[PDB]
Amino acid sequence: EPRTHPTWLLHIFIPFSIIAFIFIATVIALRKQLSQKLYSSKDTTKRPVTTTKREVNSAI
């Protein structure tokens, strides 16, 4: 039968489609893992500094 949609376009759309699909799936998947990782984040703790005044007996 006559051809109206050249397969050449399909030959190029297949790689461009699959490659582009995995590109968006890899970036989102990587971000998803990092998002889950950030739950508490240990280390880099901050302890309190100075709470009760000490002062000395000598007023001056």
Rounded distance between C-alpha atoms, residue 41 and residue 47, angstroms: 15
Q: List the determination method.
A: NMR
CA 49 to chain centre: 33
Q: What is the DSSP letter of 12?
A: H
**For the chain, what is the largest distance between any 2 Cα atoms, rounded to a whole number of angstroms?**
108
Phi-psi region of 41 (alpha: psi -120 to 50; beta: other; left: phi over 0): left
Q: How many CB atoms lie within 10 A of CB 51?
A: 5
Rounded distance between C-alpha atoms, residue 4 and residue 40, angstroms: 58
Q: How many CA atoms lie within 13 A of 30 on its CB side?
A: 6
Q: Give strand ranges (E) for the chain.
A: none
